[PDB]
């Protein structure tokens, strides 16, 4: 089997991407944030505290003839941005782009933190990291991909995120028309539950490539590119007037600037992030200070190849017995 679904930016900045997901019988379609940095499929629901729902579409398990309470199971998750959610668990039928899993754990939120409430466009998350990170207790549950894997034509999924445009998540096949050149595959460590790999270096604009190992995670659920402070300083030094602002929470730059590209290495291959992808717009409405899309990972404890980096590539998440990642230009 295979599946193929379009993923759409939630706003004009590509702050996140939503993908429609069918849950239950009859189908209830929710727009979920596919997150290769976490491993829980959780949704706003008829159980979510009413004051914490503000425009999201909810899953109502009592209206699904295939929903079953997973007795005694609870979940609770905290994300790197400080947001969180928790609740109980049903199993139900879940379909993505024509690919169906029966008995998928659907984590129903009883509580969500303010940032989730305040984002009416995201109805929940669909985790695509390794199932060892799933938070369901006392019986840990599998991700949608883990449950689908054995049925897929090939044990892979691909992320093809758009810049200010829709893109595609495919399951079970590699669309050879969706990228240019060849796909370069690179080793993955699953020791922390992430799609963790080592980039071979970077370049800023037209500058020379610096060969240096940068361990980090391929994380579709993180907006920006978080790299070591040395690398980030080297980037922003090429932008007149750019500075790190403690009050804003990162590097800002004059909105009048033209940003240089940023290249990262995948083995001997190179992925180029155009400068425009690194512009996240005014820090507040009407400001001429703009927020940068490359930020320091110092204090986060891990480097994160988030959407800014991944949207410059066609990315293969290879869930073979020994997982690997593939990157191609597009």
PDB file of C-alpha atoms in Angstrom:
ATOM      1  CA  UNK A   1       0.000   0.000   0.000  1.00  0.00           C
ATOM      2  CA  UNK A   2       0.870   3.686  -0.246  1.00  0.00           C
ATOM      3  CA  UNK A   3      -0.550   7.026   0.804  1.00  0.00           C
ATOM      4  CA  UNK A   4      -0.077  10.582  -0.434  1.00  0.00           C
ATOM      5  CA  UNK A   5      -1.381  13.745   1.229  1.00  0.00           C
ATOM      6  CA  UNK A   6      -0.877  17.429   0.606  1.00  0.00           C
ATOM      7  CA  UNK A   7       0.545  19.501   3.455  1.00  0.00           C
ATOM      8  CA  UNK A   8      -0.275  23.217   3.605  1.00  0.00           C
ATOM      9  CA  UNK A   9       1.386  26.109   5.496  1.00  0.00           C
ATOM     10  CA  UNK A  10      -0.802  27.448   8.289  1.00  0.00           C
ATOM     11  CA  UNK A  11       0.121  31.085   7.572  1.00  0.00           C
ATOM     12  CA  UNK A  12       2.132  33.347   5.270  1.00  0.00           C
ATOM     13  CA  UNK A  13       5.391  32.613   7.153  1.00  0.00           C
ATOM     14  CA  UNK A  14       5.292  28.800   6.978  1.00  0.00           C
ATOM     15  CA  UNK A  15       5.172  28.686  10.779  1.00  0.00           C
ATOM     16  CA  UNK A  16       3.913  25.097  10.519  1.00  0.00           C
ATOM     17  CA  UNK A  17       2.195  22.791   8.048  1.00  0.00           C
ATOM     18  CA  UNK A  18      -1.126  20.958   8.343  1.00  0.00           C
ATOM     19  CA  UNK A  19      -2.140  17.725   6.641  1.00  0.00           C
ATOM     20  CA  UNK A  20      -5.715  16.379   6.592  1.00  0.00           C
ATOM     21  CA  UNK A  21      -6.198  13.081   8.447  1.00  0.00           C
ATOM     22  CA  UNK A  22      -9.340  10.911   8.507  1.00  0.00           C
ATOM     23  CA  UNK A  23     -10.174   9.468  11.941  1.00  0.00           C
ATOM     24  CA  UNK A  24     -13.028   7.121  12.770  1.00  0.00           C
ATOM     25  CA  UNK A  25     -16.157   5.811  11.078  1.00  0.00           C
ATOM     26  CA  UNK A  26     -17.701   7.779   9.489  1.00  0.00           C
ATOM     27  CA  UNK A  27     -14.533   9.749   8.870  1.00  0.00           C
ATOM     28  CA  UNK A  28     -13.837  12.852  10.936  1.00  0.00           C
ATOM     29  CA  UNK A  29     -11.219  14.922   9.104  1.00  0.00           C
ATOM     30  CA  UNK A  30      -8.791  16.848  11.308  1.00  0.00           C
ATOM     31  CA  UNK A  31      -5.825  18.950  10.140  1.00  0.00           C
ATOM     32  CA  UNK A  32      -2.763  17.629  11.964  1.00  0.00           C
ATOM     33  CA  UNK A  33       0.820  18.857  12.271  1.00  0.00           C
ATOM     34  CA  UNK A  34       3.016  15.973  11.080  1.00  0.00           C
ATOM     35  CA  UNK A  35       5.967  16.020  13.470  1.00  0.00           C
ATOM     36  CA  UNK A  36       9.076  13.898  12.825  1.00  0.00           C
ATOM     37  CA  UNK A  37      10.349  15.116  16.216  1.00  0.00           C
ATOM     38  CA  UNK A  38       7.701  13.417  18.368  1.00  0.00           C
ATOM     39  CA  UNK A  39       5.801  10.150  18.515  1.00  0.00           C
ATOM     40  CA  UNK A  40       2.240  10.830  19.731  1.00  0.00           C
ATOM     41  CA  UNK A  41      -0.841  11.198  17.539  1.00  0.00           C
ATOM     42  CA  UNK A  42      -3.036  13.486  19.630  1.00  0.00           C
ATOM     43  CA  UNK A  43      -6.125  15.514  18.796  1.00  0.00           C
ATOM     44  CA  UNK A  44      -8.421  18.186  20.077  1.00  0.00           C
ATOM     45  CA  UNK A  45     -11.555  16.325  21.056  1.00  0.00           C
ATOM     46  CA  UNK A  46     -14.978  16.394  22.639  1.00  0.00           C
ATOM     47  CA  UNK A  47     -13.068  15.730  25.894  1.00  0.00           C
ATOM     48  CA  UNK A  48     -10.893  18.853  25.657  1.00  0.00           C
ATOM     49  CA  UNK A  49     -11.603  21.453  28.347  1.00  0.00           C
ATOM     50  CA  UNK A  50     -14.062  23.767  26.618  1.00  0.00           C
ATOM     51  CA  UNK A  51     -12.220  26.994  27.478  1.00  0.00           C
ATOM     52  CA  UNK A  52      -9.100  25.566  25.806  1.00  0.00           C
ATOM     53  CA  UNK A  53     -10.812  25.047  22.418  1.00  0.00           C
ATOM     54  CA  UNK A  54     -10.892  28.127  20.175  1.00  0.00           C
ATOM     55  CA  UNK A  55     -11.783  27.255  16.583  1.00  0.00           C
ATOM     56  CA  UNK A  56     -10.127  23.840  16.197  1.00  0.00           C
ATOM     57  CA  UNK A  57     -11.963  20.897  14.705  1.00  0.00           C
ATOM     58  CA  UNK A  58     -12.511  18.214  17.343  1.00  0.00           C
ATOM     59  CA  UNK A  59     -12.584  14.435  17.255  1.00  0.00           C
ATOM     60  CA  UNK A  60     -15.699  13.014  18.936  1.00  0.00           C
ATOM     61  CA  UNK A  61     -15.039   9.324  19.657  1.00  0.00           C
ATOM     62  CA  UNK A  62     -18.660   8.667  20.664  1.00  0.00           C
ATOM     63  CA  UNK A  63     -19.664   9.371  17.041  1.00  0.00           C
ATOM     64  CA  UNK A  64     -17.180   6.821  15.645  1.00  0.00           C
ATOM     65  CA  UNK A  65     -18.452   3.248  15.424  1.00  0.00           C
ATOM     66  CA  UNK A  66     -14.838   1.987  15.301  1.00  0.00           C
ATOM     67  CA  UNK A  67     -13.551   3.931  18.323  1.00  0.00           C
ATOM     68  CA  UNK A  68     -12.671   1.957  21.450  1.00  0.00           C
ATOM     69  CA  UNK A  69     -11.433   3.371  24.739  1.00  0.00           C
ATOM     70  CA  UNK A  70      -7.947   2.043  25.496  1.00  0.00           C
ATOM     71  CA  UNK A  71      -8.773   1.267  29.092  1.00  0.00           C
ATOM     72  CA  UNK A  72      -6.496   2.833  31.685  1.00  0.00           C
ATOM     73  CA  UNK A  73      -4.228   4.529  29.154  1.00  0.00           C
ATOM     74  CA  UNK A  74      -3.184   8.150  29.602  1.00  0.00           C
ATOM     75  CA  UNK A  75      -0.679  10.407  27.886  1.00  0.00           C
ATOM     76  CA  UNK A  76       1.123  13.653  28.644  1.00  0.00           C
ATOM     77  CA  UNK A  77       3.664  15.418  26.462  1.00  0.00           C
ATOM     78  CA  UNK A  78       5.820  18.539  26.660  1.00  0.00           C
ATOM     79  CA  UNK A  79       7.491  19.992  23.593  1.00  0.00           C
ATOM     80  CA  UNK A  80      10.726  21.911  23.163  1.00  0.00           C
ATOM     81  CA  UNK A  81       8.837  25.191  22.739  1.00  0.00           C
ATOM     82  CA  UNK A  82       7.310  24.830  26.210  1.00  0.00           C
ATOM     83  CA  UNK A  83       3.857  23.761  25.007  1.00  0.00           C
ATOM     84  CA  UNK A  84       2.113  20.670  26.351  1.00  0.00           C
ATOM     85  CA  UNK A  85      -1.026  18.544  26.229  1.00  0.00           C
ATOM     86  CA  UNK A  86      -2.437  15.464  27.964  1.00  0.00           C
ATOM     87  CA  UNK A  87      -5.443  13.169  28.073  1.00  0.00           C
ATOM     88  CA  UNK A  88      -6.731   9.627  27.510  1.00  0.00           C
ATOM     89  CA  UNK A  89      -6.547   7.245  24.564  1.00  0.00           C
ATOM     90  CA  UNK A  90      -8.824   5.568  22.031  1.00  0.00           C
ATOM     91  CA  UNK A  91      -7.992   3.177  19.246  1.00  0.00           C
ATOM     92  CA  UNK A  92      -9.638   3.944  15.921  1.00  0.00           C
ATOM     93  CA  UNK A  93      -9.169   3.766  12.162  1.00  0.00           C
ATOM     94  CA  UNK A  94      -6.855   6.471  10.830  1.00  0.00           C
ATOM     95  CA  UNK A  95      -6.238   7.226   7.155  1.00  0.00           C
ATOM     96  CA  UNK A  96      -3.694   9.560   5.582  1.00  0.00           C
ATOM     97  CA  UNK A  97      -3.838  10.207   1.863  1.00  0.00           C
ATOM     98  CA  UNK A  98      -5.565   6.890   1.180  1.00  0.00           C
ATOM     99  CA  UNK A  99      -3.380   4.775   3.521  1.00  0.00           C
ATOM    100  CA  UNK A 100      -5.419   3.222   6.340  1.00  0.00           C
ATOM    101  CA  UNK A 101      -4.306   1.891   9.732  1.00  0.00           C
ATOM    102  CA  UNK A 102      -6.826   0.108  11.924  1.00  0.00           C
ATOM    103  CA  UNK A 103      -6.362   0.124  15.678  1.00  0.00           C
ATOM    104  CA  UNK A 104      -4.226   3.272  15.733  1.00  0.00           C
ATOM    105  CA  UNK A 105      -3.841   4.922  19.130  1.00  0.00           C
ATOM    106  CA  UNK A 106      -5.597   8.286  18.935  1.00  0.00           C
ATOM    107  CA  UNK A 107      -4.662  10.330  21.998  1.00  0.00           C
ATOM    108  CA  UNK A 108      -7.617  12.502  22.989  1.00  0.00           C
ATOM    109  CA  UNK A 109      -6.663  15.765  24.684  1.00  0.00           C
ATOM    110  CA  UNK A 110      -8.318  16.662  27.946  1.00  0.00           C
ATOM    111  CA  UNK A 111      -5.922  19.596  28.427  1.00  0.00           C
ATOM    112  CA  UNK A 112      -3.799  21.658  26.040  1.00  0.00           C
ATOM    113  CA  UNK A 113      -1.497  24.585  26.756  1.00  0.00           C
ATOM    114  CA  UNK A 114      -2.238  28.122  25.650  1.00  0.00           C
ATOM    115  CA  UNK A 115      -0.186  28.048  22.460  1.00  0.00           C
ATOM    116  CA  UNK A 116      -2.297  25.172  21.133  1.00  0.00           C
ATOM    117  CA  UNK A 117      -5.570  26.906  22.057  1.00  0.00           C
ATOM    118  CA  UNK A 118      -4.355  30.101  20.400  1.00  0.00           C
ATOM    119  CA  UNK A 119      -3.625  28.359  17.078  1.00  0.00           C
ATOM    120  CA  UNK A 120      -7.005  27.617  15.541  1.00  0.00           C
ATOM    121  CA  UNK A 121      -5.443  26.016  12.446  1.00  0.00           C
ATOM    122  CA  UNK A 122      -3.839  22.967  14.126  1.00  0.00           C
ATOM    123  CA  UNK A 123      -6.241  20.261  15.324  1.00  0.00           C
ATOM    124  CA  UNK A 124      -3.494  18.059  16.790  1.00  0.00           C
ATOM    125  CA  UNK A 125      -0.176  16.407  16.030  1.00  0.00           C
ATOM    126  CA  UNK A 126       0.781  13.221  14.189  1.00  0.00           C
ATOM    127  CA  UNK A 127       4.154  12.039  15.463  1.00  0.00           C
ATOM    128  CA  UNK A 128       6.614  10.421  13.061  1.00  0.00           C
ATOM    129  CA  UNK A 129       9.691   9.971  15.277  1.00  0.00           C
ATOM    130  CA  UNK A 130      10.457   6.537  16.728  1.00  0.00           C
ATOM    131  CA  UNK A 131       7.813   4.846  18.859  1.00  0.00           C
ATOM    132  CA  UNK A 132      10.215   4.659  21.814  1.00  0.00           C
ATOM    133  CA  UNK A 133       9.287   8.322  22.485  1.00  0.00           C
ATOM    134  CA  UNK A 134       5.533   7.699  22.632  1.00  0.00           C
ATOM    135  CA  UNK A 135       4.168   8.927  25.966  1.00  0.00           C
ATOM    136  CA  UNK A 136       1.172   6.598  26.464  1.00  0.00           C
ATOM    137  CA  UNK A 137       1.200   4.884  29.852  1.00  0.00           C
ATOM    138  CA  UNK A 138       1.176   2.157  31.050  1.00  0.00           C
ATOM    139  CA  UNK A 139       1.372   0.567  27.576  1.00  0.00           C
ATOM    140  CA  UNK A 140       3.415   2.556  25.065  1.00  0.00           C
ATOM    141  CA  UNK A 141       1.781   2.889  21.646  1.00  0.00           C
ATOM    142  CA  UNK A 142       3.105   2.840  18.085  1.00  0.00           C
ATOM    143  CA  UNK A 143       3.162   5.710  15.617  1.00  0.00           C
ATOM    144  CA  UNK A 144       1.030   5.739  12.496  1.00  0.00           C
ATOM    145  CA  UNK A 145       4.120   4.983  10.400  1.00  0.00           C
ATOM    146  CA  UNK A 146       5.198   2.112  12.644  1.00  0.00           C
ATOM    147  CA  UNK A 147       1.719   0.581  12.392  1.00  0.00           C
ATOM    148  CA  UNK A 148       1.570   1.044   8.598  1.00  0.00           C
ATOM    149  CA  UNK A 149       5.152   0.032   7.831  1.00  0.00           C
ATOM    150  CA  UNK A 150       4.702  -3.686   7.191  1.00  0.00           C
ATOM    151  CA  UNK A 151       1.865  -2.998   4.725  1.00  0.00           C
ATOM    152  CA  UNK A 152       3.713  -0.344   2.744  1.00  0.00           C
ATOM    153  CA  UNK A 153       5.276  -1.087  -0.623  1.00  0.00           C
ATOM    154  CA  UNK A 154       8.566   0.201   0.845  1.00  0.00           C
ATOM    155  CA  UNK A 155       9.123   1.051   4.546  1.00  0.00           C
ATOM    156  CA  UNK A 156       9.579   4.781   3.973  1.00  0.00           C
ATOM    157  CA  UNK A 157       7.854   8.117   4.119  1.00  0.00           C
ATOM    158  CA  UNK A 158       8.933  11.344   2.447  1.00  0.00           C
ATOM    159  CA  UNK A 159       8.559  15.015   3.346  1.00  0.00           C
ATOM    160  CA  UNK A 160       8.414  17.573   0.537  1.00  0.00           C
ATOM    161  CA  UNK A 161       7.565  20.839   2.258  1.00  0.00           C
ATOM    162  CA  UNK A 162       6.872  23.949   0.208  1.00  0.00           C
ATOM    163  CA  UNK A 163       8.213  27.464   0.610  1.00  0.00           C
ATOM    164  CA  UNK A 164       5.128  29.658   0.969  1.00  0.00           C
ATOM    165  CA  UNK A 165       3.241  26.910  -0.878  1.00  0.00           C
ATOM    166  CA  UNK A 166       1.734  23.449  -0.314  1.00  0.00           C
ATOM    167  CA  UNK A 167       3.847  20.302  -0.408  1.00  0.00           C
ATOM    168  CA  UNK A 168       3.433  16.558   0.059  1.00  0.00           C
ATOM    169  CA  UNK A 169       3.858  13.730   2.551  1.00  0.00           C
ATOM    170  CA  UNK A 170       4.094  10.332   0.843  1.00  0.00           C
ATOM    171  CA  UNK A 171       4.039   6.945   2.557  1.00  0.00           C
ATOM    172  CA  UNK A 172       5.431   3.758   1.054  1.00  0.00           C
ATOM    173  CA  UNK A 173       7.074   5.086  -2.120  1.00  0.00           C
ATOM    174  CA  UNK A 174       9.609   7.606  -3.401  1.00  0.00           C
ATOM    175  CA  UNK A 175       8.214   9.936  -6.102  1.00  0.00           C
ATOM    176  CA  UNK A 176      11.152  10.130  -8.490  1.00  0.00           C
ATOM    177  CA  UNK A 177       9.561  13.161 -10.212  1.00  0.00           C
ATOM    178  CA  UNK A 178       9.618  15.235  -6.996  1.00  0.00           C
ATOM    179  CA  UNK A 179      13.361  15.980  -6.831  1.00  0.00           C
ATOM    180  CA  UNK A 180      16.347  16.800  -9.021  1.00  0.00           C
ATOM    181  CA  UNK A 181      19.590  14.889  -9.190  1.00  0.00           C
ATOM    182  CA  UNK A 182      20.074  11.971  -6.817  1.00  0.00           C
ATOM    183  CA  UNK A 183      19.108  11.306  -3.207  1.00  0.00           C
ATOM    184  CA  UNK A 184      22.072  11.191  -0.816  1.00  0.00           C
ATOM    185  CA  UNK A 185      21.493   8.857   2.112  1.00  0.00           C
ATOM    186  CA  UNK A 186      23.140   9.328   5.491  1.00  0.00           C
ATOM    187  CA  UNK A 187      23.262   7.349   8.724  1.00  0.00           C
ATOM    188  CA  UNK A 188      20.712   7.758  11.518  1.00  0.00           C
ATOM    189  CA  UNK A 189      21.047   7.199  15.254  1.00  0.00           C
ATOM    190  CA  UNK A 190      17.802   6.199  16.947  1.00  0.00           C
ATOM    191  CA  UNK A 191      19.368   6.332  20.426  1.00  0.00           C
ATOM    192  CA  UNK A 192      17.375   9.448  21.424  1.00  0.00           C
ATOM    193  CA  UNK A 193      14.233   8.404  19.520  1.00  0.00           C
ATOM    194  CA  UNK A 194      14.784  11.005  16.773  1.00  0.00           C
ATOM    195  CA  UNK A 195      15.792  10.998  13.118  1.00  0.00           C
ATOM    196  CA  UNK A 196      19.261  12.047  14.257  1.00  0.00           C
ATOM    197  CA  UNK A 197      22.040  12.410  11.691  1.00  0.00           C
ATOM    198  CA  UNK A 198      25.325  14.260  11.156  1.00  0.00           C
ATOM    199  CA  UNK A 199      25.657  17.011   8.574  1.00  0.00           C
ATOM    200  CA  UNK A 200      29.100  17.337   7.019  1.00  0.00           C
ATOM    201  CA  UNK A 201      29.312  21.151   7.189  1.00  0.00           C
ATOM    202  CA  UNK A 202      27.974  24.449   5.938  1.00  0.00           C
ATOM    203  CA  UNK A 203      28.526  27.521   3.807  1.00  0.00           C
ATOM    204  CA  UNK A 204      27.142  31.056   4.071  1.00  0.00           C
ATOM    205  CA  UNK A 205      26.100  32.648   0.791  1.00  0.00           C
ATOM    206  CA  UNK A 206      28.784  32.239  -1.852  1.00  0.00           C
ATOM    207  CA  UNK A 207      31.424  31.553   0.801  1.00  0.00           C
ATOM    208  CA  UNK A 208      33.633  28.516   1.027  1.00  0.00           C
ATOM    209  CA  UNK A 209      32.258  25.332   2.543  1.00  0.00           C
ATOM    210  CA  UNK A 210      33.380  24.581   6.102  1.00  0.00           C
ATOM    211  CA  UNK A 211      33.762  20.852   6.675  1.00  0.00           C
ATOM    212  CA  UNK A 212      32.593  20.153  10.223  1.00  0.00           C
ATOM    213  CA  UNK A 213      30.339  17.511  11.770  1.00  0.00           C
ATOM    214  CA  UNK A 214      26.979  18.858  12.985  1.00  0.00           C
ATOM    215  CA  UNK A 215      24.823  16.277  14.764  1.00  0.00           C
ATOM    216  CA  UNK A 216      21.138  17.172  14.698  1.00  0.00           C
ATOM    217  CA  UNK A 217      17.593  15.979  14.102  1.00  0.00           C
ATOM    218  CA  UNK A 218      15.337  16.154  11.052  1.00  0.00           C
ATOM    219  CA  UNK A 219      12.247  17.713  12.671  1.00  0.00           C
ATOM    220  CA  UNK A 220       9.239  18.707  10.566  1.00  0.00           C
ATOM    221  CA  UNK A 221       7.484  19.950  13.708  1.00  0.00           C
ATOM    222  CA  UNK A 222      10.053  22.700  14.387  1.00  0.00           C
ATOM    223  CA  UNK A 223       9.754  25.856  12.285  1.00  0.00           C
ATOM    224  CA  UNK A 224      13.342  27.119  12.272  1.00  0.00           C
ATOM    225  CA  UNK A 225      16.911  25.873  11.812  1.00  0.00           C
ATOM    226  CA  UNK A 226      18.766  25.670  15.147  1.00  0.00           C
ATOM    227  CA  UNK A 227      22.546  25.259  14.884  1.00  0.00           C
ATOM    228  CA  UNK A 228      25.629  25.821  17.044  1.00  0.00           C
ATOM    229  CA  UNK A 229      26.291  29.410  18.066  1.00  0.00           C
ATOM    230  CA  UNK A 230      29.519  29.533  16.035  1.00  0.00           C
ATOM    231  CA  UNK A 231      27.685  28.615  12.805  1.00  0.00           C
ATOM    232  CA  UNK A 232      24.798  30.998  13.484  1.00  0.00           C
ATOM    233  CA  UNK A 233      27.151  33.894  14.267  1.00  0.00           C
ATOM    234  CA  UNK A 234      29.012  33.270  11.010  1.00  0.00           C
ATOM    235  CA  UNK A 235      25.712  33.457   9.107  1.00  0.00           C
ATOM    236  CA  UNK A 236      24.342  36.645  10.686  1.00  0.00           C
ATOM    237  CA  UNK A 237      27.710  38.409  10.451  1.00  0.00           C
ATOM    238  CA  UNK A 238      27.015  38.571   6.704  1.00  0.00           C
ATOM    239  CA  UNK A 239      23.829  40.626   7.236  1.00  0.00           C
ATOM    240  CA  UNK A 240      24.382  44.330   7.955  1.00  0.00           C
ATOM    241  CA  UNK A 241      22.689  45.331  11.188  1.00  0.00           C
ATOM    242  CA  UNK A 242      21.803  41.813  12.318  1.00  0.00           C
ATOM    243  CA  UNK A 243      22.191  41.147  16.022  1.00  0.00           C
ATOM    244  CA  UNK A 244      21.146  38.719  18.717  1.00  0.00           C
ATOM    245  CA  UNK A 245      18.415  40.274  20.853  1.00  0.00           C
ATOM    246  CA  UNK A 246      17.877  38.817  24.322  1.00  0.00           C
ATOM    247  CA  UNK A 247      14.588  40.717  24.604  1.00  0.00           C
ATOM    248  CA  UNK A 248      13.211  39.322  21.348  1.00  0.00           C
ATOM    249  CA  UNK A 249      14.689  35.842  21.889  1.00  0.00           C
ATOM    250  CA  UNK A 250      17.146  35.433  19.039  1.00  0.00           C
ATOM    251  CA  UNK A 251      18.747  36.975  15.999  1.00  0.00           C
ATOM    252  CA  UNK A 252      16.887  39.820  14.336  1.00  0.00           C
ATOM    253  CA  UNK A 253      17.839  41.738  11.227  1.00  0.00           C
ATOM    254  CA  UNK A 254      16.698  44.837   9.335  1.00  0.00           C
ATOM    255  CA  UNK A 255      13.636  44.009   7.279  1.00  0.00           C
ATOM    256  CA  UNK A 256      15.286  45.974   4.434  1.00  0.00           C
ATOM    257  CA  UNK A 257      18.061  43.369   4.139  1.00  0.00           C
ATOM    258  CA  UNK A 258      18.567  40.834   1.380  1.00  0.00           C
ATOM    259  CA  UNK A 259      19.562  37.632   3.167  1.00  0.00           C
ATOM    260  CA  UNK A 260      22.323  35.296   1.961  1.00  0.00           C
ATOM    261  CA  UNK A 261      21.661  31.634   1.338  1.00  0.00           C
ATOM    262  CA  UNK A 262      22.792  28.927   3.734  1.00  0.00           C
ATOM    263  CA  UNK A 263      24.170  25.581   2.545  1.00  0.00           C
ATOM    264  CA  UNK A 264      24.333  22.414   4.624  1.00  0.00           C
ATOM    265  CA  UNK A 265      26.186  19.216   3.782  1.00  0.00           C
ATOM    266  CA  UNK A 266      24.703  15.737   3.451  1.00  0.00           C
ATOM    267  CA  UNK A 267      27.696  13.504   2.890  1.00  0.00           C
ATOM    268  CA  UNK A 268      29.401  14.923  -0.179  1.00  0.00           C
ATOM    269  CA  UNK A 269      26.133  16.548  -1.335  1.00  0.00           C
ATOM    270  CA  UNK A 270      24.925  20.060  -0.598  1.00  0.00           C
ATOM    271  CA  UNK A 271      21.455  21.459   0.124  1.00  0.00           C
ATOM    272  CA  UNK A 272      21.060  25.207  -0.459  1.00  0.00           C
ATOM    273  CA  UNK A 273      18.517  27.150   1.607  1.00  0.00           C
ATOM    274  CA  UNK A 274      17.719  30.381  -0.297  1.00  0.00           C
ATOM    275  CA  UNK A 275      18.017  33.570   1.715  1.00  0.00           C
ATOM    276  CA  UNK A 276      14.295  34.295   1.459  1.00  0.00           C
ATOM    277  CA  UNK A 277      13.547  31.075   3.378  1.00  0.00           C
ATOM    278  CA  UNK A 278      15.369  32.590   6.380  1.00  0.00           C
ATOM    279  CA  UNK A 279      13.068  35.648   6.663  1.00  0.00           C
ATOM    280  CA  UNK A 280      10.356  35.250   9.321  1.00  0.00           C
ATOM    281  CA  UNK A 281       9.065  38.777   9.035  1.00  0.00           C
ATOM    282  CA  UNK A 282       8.558  41.631  11.468  1.00  0.00           C
ATOM    283  CA  UNK A 283       9.019  40.810  15.150  1.00  0.00           C
ATOM    284  CA  UNK A 284       5.721  42.628  15.825  1.00  0.00           C
ATOM    285  CA  UNK A 285       3.231  44.093  13.392  1.00  0.00           C
ATOM    286  CA  UNK A 286       4.668  47.118  11.625  1.00  0.00           C
ATOM    287  CA  UNK A 287       8.200  46.708  12.975  1.00  0.00           C
ATOM    288  CA  UNK A 288      11.204  47.108  10.697  1.00  0.00           C
ATOM    289  CA  UNK A 289      13.096  44.502  12.728  1.00  0.00           C
ATOM    290  CA  UNK A 290      12.642  41.038  11.250  1.00  0.00           C
ATOM    291  CA  UNK A 291      13.088  37.655  12.931  1.00  0.00           C
ATOM    292  CA  UNK A 292      15.736  35.294  11.615  1.00  0.00           C
ATOM    293  CA  UNK A 293      15.104  31.739  10.495  1.00  0.00           C
ATOM    294  CA  UNK A 294      18.511  30.445  11.619  1.00  0.00           C
ATOM    295  CA  UNK A 295      18.919  30.569  15.394  1.00  0.00           C
ATOM    296  CA  UNK A 296      21.307  29.220  18.006  1.00  0.00           C
ATOM    297  CA  UNK A 297      20.718  25.782  19.501  1.00  0.00           C
ATOM    298  CA  UNK A 298      22.737  26.745  22.589  1.00  0.00           C
ATOM    299  CA  UNK A 299      20.646  25.852  25.611  1.00  0.00           C
ATOM    300  CA  UNK A 300      18.355  23.546  23.627  1.00  0.00           C
ATOM    301  CA  UNK A 301      20.868  20.693  23.886  1.00  0.00           C
ATOM    302  CA  UNK A 302      20.431  19.467  20.301  1.00  0.00           C
ATOM    303  CA  UNK A 303      20.708  20.929  16.822  1.00  0.00           C
ATOM    304  CA  UNK A 304      17.423  20.941  14.907  1.00  0.00           C
ATOM    305  CA  UNK A 305      17.046  20.796  11.124  1.00  0.00           C
ATOM    306  CA  UNK A 306      13.513  22.184  11.179  1.00  0.00           C
ATOM    307  CA  UNK A 307      11.268  23.341   8.371  1.00  0.00           C
ATOM    308  CA  UNK A 308      13.635  26.118   7.186  1.00  0.00           C
ATOM    309  CA  UNK A 309      16.163  23.438   6.250  1.00  0.00           C
ATOM    310  CA  UNK A 310      13.848  20.591   5.298  1.00  0.00           C
ATOM    311  CA  UNK A 311      11.708  22.663   2.907  1.00  0.00           C
ATOM    312  CA  UNK A 312      14.829  23.209   0.755  1.00  0.00           C
ATOM    313  CA  UNK A 313      15.001  19.444   0.127  1.00  0.00           C
ATOM    314  CA  UNK A 314      13.099  16.301  -0.738  1.00  0.00           C
ATOM    315  CA  UNK A 315      13.611  14.233   2.433  1.00  0.00           C
ATOM    316  CA  UNK A 316      13.352  10.442   2.721  1.00  0.00           C
ATOM    317  CA  UNK A 317      12.680   8.960   6.165  1.00  0.00           C
ATOM    318  CA  UNK A 318      13.802   5.370   5.544  1.00  0.00           C
ATOM    319  CA  UNK A 319      12.381   3.054   8.197  1.00  0.00           C
ATOM    320  CA  UNK A 320      14.194  -0.068   7.050  1.00  0.00           C
ATOM    321  CA  UNK A 321      15.635  -2.357   9.725  1.00  0.00           C
ATOM    322  CA  UNK A 322      18.553   0.064   9.918  1.00  0.00           C
ATOM    323  CA  UNK A 323      16.933   3.488   9.399  1.00  0.00           C
ATOM    324  CA  UNK A 324      18.591   6.145   7.249  1.00  0.00           C
ATOM    325  CA  UNK A 325      17.741   9.629   5.962  1.00  0.00           C
ATOM    326  CA  UNK A 326      17.906  10.741   2.343  1.00  0.00           C
ATOM    327  CA  UNK A 327      18.157  14.296   1.027  1.00  0.00           C
ATOM    328  CA  UNK A 328      17.781  15.551  -2.536  1.00  0.00           C
ATOM    329  CA  UNK A 329      17.611  19.003  -4.032  1.00  0.00           C
ATOM    330  CA  UNK A 330      14.355  19.902  -5.772  1.00  0.00           C
TER     331      UNK A 330
END
